[PDB]
Amino acid sequence: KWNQPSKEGKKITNLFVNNSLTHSKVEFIPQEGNKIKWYACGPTVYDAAHLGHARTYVSFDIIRRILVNYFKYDVFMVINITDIDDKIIKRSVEEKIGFTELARKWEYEFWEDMKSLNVLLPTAITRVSEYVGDIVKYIEKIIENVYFDIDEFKKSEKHFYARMEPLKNAYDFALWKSSKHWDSPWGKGRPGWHIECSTMASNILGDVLDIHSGGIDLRFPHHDNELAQSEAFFDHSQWVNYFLHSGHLHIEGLKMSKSLKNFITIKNMLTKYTSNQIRILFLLNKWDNFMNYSPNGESMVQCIEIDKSFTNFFAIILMKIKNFDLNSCNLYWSDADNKLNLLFRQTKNKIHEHFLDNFNTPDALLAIQKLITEINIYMDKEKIQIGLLLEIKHYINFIFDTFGLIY
Amino acid sequence: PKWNQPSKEGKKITNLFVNNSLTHSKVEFIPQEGNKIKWYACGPTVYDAAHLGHARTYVSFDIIRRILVNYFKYDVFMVINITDIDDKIIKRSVEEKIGFTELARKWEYEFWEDMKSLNVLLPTAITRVSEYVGDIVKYIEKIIENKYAYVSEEGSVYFDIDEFKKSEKHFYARMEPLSVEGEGDLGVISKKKKNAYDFALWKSSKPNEPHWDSPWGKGRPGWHIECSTMASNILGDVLDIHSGGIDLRFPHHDNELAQSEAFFDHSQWVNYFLHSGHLHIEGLKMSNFITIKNMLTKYTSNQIRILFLLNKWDNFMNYSPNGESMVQCIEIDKSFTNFFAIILMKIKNFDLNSCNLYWSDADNKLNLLFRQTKNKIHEHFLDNFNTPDALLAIQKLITEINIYMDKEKIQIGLLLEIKHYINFIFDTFGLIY
Ligand SMILES: [Zn+2]
Ligand SMILES: [Zn+2]
């Protein structure tokens, strides 16, 4: 059974997150102080990245921004790059170009797409090719406690297999694959599909991870196997306290799958839309829920309206401040000034409640929209409290900074 | 006497401690409501150019306001008054043969311009005394209805201190009880005032001076009544924070406190009273002044703020006019600028294709110092806004980042995250690089 961390000496914000280990919304408690150790599964570098990747990394970029810029947690984040893999091998033979040269090509394009979307880079980037030796040492320790013996793993009282999805032996999975290459004590081989993530996360972050994230497709078999693998290495029972899984994205009602050729590259999207509009799209959909994207701008129409209204809001308010004259004005605190201020401080508490509610950005975005509507009337008709307008502009800048929006 | 700490239930608790002048000690800070802080700060007297003493107080509280909001996420509602009608202004307006409003408007504009030059944020509300005179008269009417003030025949009103003390719920001069011997004051012998320590709420006006209509006759507000009136109307019966320089603790703030307790008839108008330390120039009180504008022809806004960051807001300070105190400030400003120049160039020219990103011991050592510095600085801010020790922490971290960037292979993501933390702290300090 999952054991929530103790609250003593830790930052307690009363934040709740959908934890796939509990299949429920639970309060988030750091393992140490205000520190959040966070490992996120990274992409497979054989292709251009598409909207499914963008949704996961932008959604967790938004979550990371909420945790750090808004709640003041101290976040240490690591993302791996899987540049050695069966799929990478096969694509290099179809294209008759080198496997490492191809992987380096699409990792560069991935990082260029992330910067185009204003996604912050993690603290550490762990490439599988640079960590193969540590992976081999990792397997050695599992044996001291190649294929994972699932039957032996369950037998232990301190270990439980498949904490997140209910469903020698067929259920055994490979840790090390025999070469059809790199040297190892057990023979030439390649890493298995899942062991790479468990190895790299353990070396940098250690025996306990505050958060582990990824898309929902990866929950089984990949993430459930990562949990079992890491518990076997350290010989303990909970390698990850909170597991966050983003929902799937369907384009025109079907899963993005290789055979369909239904993918939309991030670069193609960016020839028609801004980073702000693409982020607004993901802010409008809850990170933990599924989404349908209708291409050709059906889904982006609402996003573009919102982006346009934020841009105009800033044009007006900066002009009003610019033309404000302290000599010619009267600064009595009117009933209109006071009513706007109450809505301003109310909106602050609403957004706080929304972020605590599992990073409910769709409702926080609507809250900002309502506040902007009220400021617009105030600026048009009422006599303006220059200090109140400036203070409001800074709060909205702070929230847009938490969203990664740039105005 | 007695102080009531706010209840902690349902409130934002950051474990911040502040030097509260009501207790003359450091007490935990608890908001009156949620995470909201209603804050009133006494403003300047607009008859002259502002000088370095005003700058120390308003910059020091600008730093605290940024710490409270940008770092701790309190929600701060701040009000500053402008005393644009006052005895000093009247005398200066007669000396210069210009109108009282024309003079006050000139030096209010120059005050806010000097504040803008130093990167001091404007408050939510700015309350000019001339715009609030009618509210002031209503405020006095209530003090009289509660029998804590009395009307002289000439047309003045005075606070009845003796009646105020008699109440069990009231104590006079809660913060400087001992500053309370004039003895044979001509006004007391005449029996106009009742006791010499009584002070005027409303002043019957002398000829050839501005005046306003009132129930007691044409007159002006007294020196202290203005701040109590204005703060109550916007913030209400309880103020989370009331700030000002230490010179104003008595009589100005103690009388402001007595007036507001009398109006509402309760015992604590202000939960936390913060008093900035004195600015001395060459070891003596500024009585030798330096205008803020003069300082800014010789030093940057960043350098002037580093000076106040180097001195704790609640402690006394010595300024050496021969540039002795600003020498260190200029060195620090120089090293922050260069650090940002270096770190920005290293980030720009980093190539993700050509690099290796194995997590080294060098990468890990910088990361550990990175997270250590975050916890140290957090503790310094909790310790009564100890900016001097937090600034030294940033300096030590910067020395190590400079070494890392030169020799070791750089983990770009760690360097970016470090730059963003330092950008975040410099925003909290009001520095701009
Ligand atoms: Zn993975
Ligand atoms: Zn005052």
Beta-strand pair A249-251/B200-204: unpaired
Beta bridge mates, B245: B276
Query: How far is Cα A175 from Cα A135, in angstroms, rounded to an integer?
Result: 10
Is B132 within 8 Å of A349 when comparing Cβ atoms?
no
Strand partners, A177: A190
Find, among A246, A230, A239, the residue nearest to A210 by Cα.
A239
For B18-51, b/e burial (b = at least 16 CB within 10 A) is: bbbbbeeeebebbbbeebbbbbbbbbbbbbbbbb
Alpha-carbon Rg of chain B, whole angstroms? 25
Using alpha carbons, list the distances in angstroms from residue B7 to B24, B30, B200, B264, B273. 20, 7, 36, 21, 17
Nearest in space to A171 (alpha carbons), one of A190, A189, A192, A147:
A147
Q: Which residue of A31, A73, A326, A350 to mutate against B (max B Cβ within 10 Å)?
A: A326
Q: What are the structural domain ranges in chain A?
A: 16-295, 301-403
Rounded CA-CA distance A210/A32 in Å is 9
- Per CATH, is A16-295 categorized as 3.40.50.620? yes
Resolution (A): 3.1
Which residue matches tokens 């025999």? A178
Task: Cis check for the bond before A43: say yes or no (omega within 30 of 0).
Answer: no
Residue B208 vs residues B17, B48, B83, B137, B223: alpha-carbon distances, Å: 50, 21, 20, 21, 19
CA pseudo-torsion sign B350, B352, B353, B358 = positive
Instruction: Report how far residue A245's alpha carbon sits from residue A242's, in angstroms, rounded to the nearest whole number.
Output: 10
Q: Does B127 sit within 8 Å of A333, measured CB to CB? A: yes
Between A and B, how many CB-CB pairs are < 8 A? 91
Strands (E), A185-343: 189-191, 209-215, 240-246, 249-251, 254-255, 291-293
**DSSP 8-state symbol, B45:** B
The Cα–Cα gap between B401 and B399 comes to 6
**Contact at CB, A348 and B108, closer than 8 angstroms:** no
- Cα→Cα distances B158→A271, B153, B155, B346, B375, Å: 74, 11, 10, 68, 52
Query: Looking at chain B, after which residues does the C atom sit over 2.5 Å from the next written N, breaking the chain?
Result: 180, 287
User: CA-to-CA distance for A222 and A212, rounded, in angstroms?
Assistant: 12
Q: Which residues of A384-398 are buried (b: 16+ CB within 10 A; e: fewer)?
A: bbbbbbbbbbebbeb
**Number of CB atoms found within 10 A of residue A86's CB:** 12
Residues in CB range of B26: below 8 A, 6 or more apart = B17, B18, B19, B20, B384
Query: Which sign, positive or negative, has the C-alpha torsion B127, B129, B135, B140?
Result: positive
Q: Which of A70, A345, A387 sits opposite B125 (nearest CB)?
A: A387
* 3-class secondary structure per residue, B384-405: CCCHHHHHHHHHHHHHHHHHHH
Residue located via tokens 């054989």:
A46
- The DSSP-derived string for A281-293 is HHHTS-TTS-EEE
Cα separation, B269 vs B40, whole angstroms: 11
- Cross-chain Cβ contact A122/B371 below 8 Å: no
Residues 6+ apart with CB under 8 A from A336: A378, A382, A383
Tokens of B201: 């709420």
Beta bridge partners of B39: B78, B241
Computed on alpha carbons and rounded to an integer, the radius of gyration of chain A in Å comes to 24
Residue numbers in A near B131 (CB within 8 A): 330-332
Contact A107 B234 (CB under 8 A): no
| Topology annotation, domain B17-276 | Rossmann fold (3.40.50)
Closest CA to A52 of A270, A185, A217: A217
Contact in structure between A42 and A79 (CB atoms under 8 Å): yes
> Using CB atoms, which residue from B126, B353, B374 is nearest to A74?
B374
Closest-CA residue of A relative to B72 is A72
Q: Are A287 and A60 in contact (CB under 8 A)?
A: yes
> How many angstroms does the Cα of residue B83 sit away from the middle of ligand 2?
9
Shortest CA distance to A269 belongs to which of A10, A51, A22, A7? A51
- Measure the CA–CA gap between B175 and B24, rounded to whole angstroms: 8
All residues of chain B having their beta carbon less than 8 Å from the beta carbon of residue A40 are none
- Token digits of residue B157: 């009103």
- Spell out a b/e string for B373-389, using b for 16 or more CB atoms within 10 Å of the CB, else e: bbebbbebbbebbbbee
Helix (H, G, I), strand (E, B) or coil at A78: strand
d(CA A398, CA A70): 8
Nearest CA distance, A5 vs chain B (angstrom): 20
A61 Cα: distance to centroid of ligand 1 (angstroms): 17
Question: What ligand is nearest to the CA atom of residue B243?
Answer: 2
Residue in A closest to B419 by C-alpha: A123
d(CA B243, CA A232): 59
What is the C-alpha separation between A348 and B33, in angstroms, rounded? 14
Residues A31 and A241: beta-carbon distance below 8 Å:
yes
Nearest CA in chain B to A342: B77
Residues B401, B384: Cα–Cα separation, whole Å? 28
Backbone angles phi, psi at A242, to 5 degrees: -130, 125
Q: Tokens 């008269």 correspond to what residue?
A: B137
Residues 6+ positions from B420 with CB-CB distance below 8 Å? none
DSSP code per residue over B316-381? -EEE-TTTHHHHHHHHHHHHHHHHHHHHHHHHHH--TTT------HHHHHHHHHHHHHHHHHHHHH
Nearest CB neighbour to A126, from listed B124, B233, B359: B359
Q: Ligand 2 centroid to B43 CA: how many Å?
A: 6
Chain B nearest C-alpha distance from A341 (Å): 9
Residue A86 structure tokens? 């069966």
What's the CA gap between B215 and B177, in Å, rounded?
A: 33
Q: Supply the DSSP symbol for B212.
A: B
Question: Does residue A295 contact residue A254 with C-beta atoms inside 8 Å?
Answer: no
d(C-alpha B408, C-alpha B415), whole Å = 12
Q: How far apart are CA A301 and CA B202, in angstroms?
A: 63
CA A214, CA A225: separation in Å to the nearest integer? 14
Cβ atoms of residues B252 and B224 within 8 Å: yes
Q: Which residues pair with B310 in a beta bridge?
A: none
Expt. technique: X-ray
Partner residue facing A121 (CB), from B131, B371, B412: B412
| Sign of the alpha-carbon torsion through A74, B377, B28, B123 | negative
Burial A73-83 (b: 16+ CB within 10 A, else e): bbbbbbbbbbb
Min Cα separation A101/chain B (Å): 10
Please report which ligand is nearest the Cα atom of B257: 2
Separation of CA B185 from chain center: 35
Write the DSSP symbol of residue B120: P
Other Cβ atoms closer than 10 A to B189 = 9
**B9/B30 Cα distance (integer angstroms):** 10
Spatial neighbors of B271 by CB under 8 A, at least 6 apart, are B6, B30, B32, B238, B239, B240, B241
Q: How far is CA B127 from the centre of its chain?
A: 16
- Is the separation of the CB atoms in B127 and B80 below 8 Å? yes
The one-letter code for the residue type at A352 is H
The helix (H) or strand (E) run that includes residue B55 is helix B52-66
- Please report where in the chains the tokens 């799209």 appear, as a residue: A281
Q: Is A91 helix (H, G, I), strand (E, B) or coil?
A: helix
What is the amino acid identity at position A236?
H
Contacts of B83 (CB under 8 A, 6+ apart): B43, B44, B45, B46, B89, B129, B226
Q: Which residues contact A373 (CB under 8 A, 6 or more apart)?
A: none
State the DSSP H helix or E strand holding residue A356, giving kind and residue range, or none if neither. helix A335-356
For residues A165 and B230, give the distance between their C-alpha atoms in angstroms, rounded to a whole number. 63
Phi-psi category of residue B151: left, alpha or beta, with phi > 0 → left and psi -120 to 50 → alpha: beta
Tell me the sheet residues that pair with B42: none
Among the partner residues B105, B357, B412, nearest to A130 by beta-carbon distance: B357
Provide the phi-psi class of B384: left if phi over 0, else alpha when psi is between -120 and 50, else beta.
left
Under an 8 Å CB criterion, which residues of B touch A?
34, 36, 71-73, 75, 77-78, 105, 108-109, 112, 121-128, 131-132, 233-234, 352-353, 356-359, 363-364, 367, 371, 374-375, 411-414, 416-417
Nearest to A360 by CA among A276, A247, A284: A284
Shortest Cα–Cα distance, B357 to chain A (Å): 6
| Residues A358/A16, Cβ–Cβ less than 8 Å | yes
DSSP-derived letter for residue A181 is -
| Whole-number Å distance between alpha carbons of A125 and B411 | 8
Give strand pairing partners of B127. Answer: B81
User: Which residues in chain A have their CB less than 8 angstroms from residue B357's CB?
Assistant: 124-127, 130
Distance from CA of B368 to the nearest CA of A (A): 11
DSSP string, B252-302: IIHHHHHHHHHHHTSS-SEEEEEEEPPEEETTEE-----BHHHHHTTS-HH
| B105/A327 Cβ within 8 A | yes
The ligand minimizing its distance to the Cα of B245 is 2
How far is the C-alpha of B19 from the C-alpha of B57, rounded, in Å?
15
Question: Do residues A170 and A148 make contact, with C-beta atoms less than 8 angstroms apart?
Answer: no
Q: Which of A118, A143, A141, A105 is nearest to A54 (CA)?
A: A118
Q: Which residues contact B354 (CB under 8 A, 6 or more apart)?
A: none
**Residues contacting residue B38 through CB under 8 Å, at least 6 positions apart:** B32, B77, B235, B236, B238, B239, B240, B241
Task: Tell me the chain B residues in contact with residue A340 when contact means C-beta distances shorter than 8 Å.
Answer: none
Inspect the interface and report whether the beta carbons of A331 and B126 lie closer than 8 Å: yes
Out of A74, A104, A124, name the one closest to residue B359 (CB).
A124
Q: Residue B27: which H helix or E strand, with range?
A: strand B25-28
* 8 Å CB contact of B77 and A345: yes
One-letter amino acid at B361 equals: D
Helix (H) or strand (E) holding B144: helix B133-145
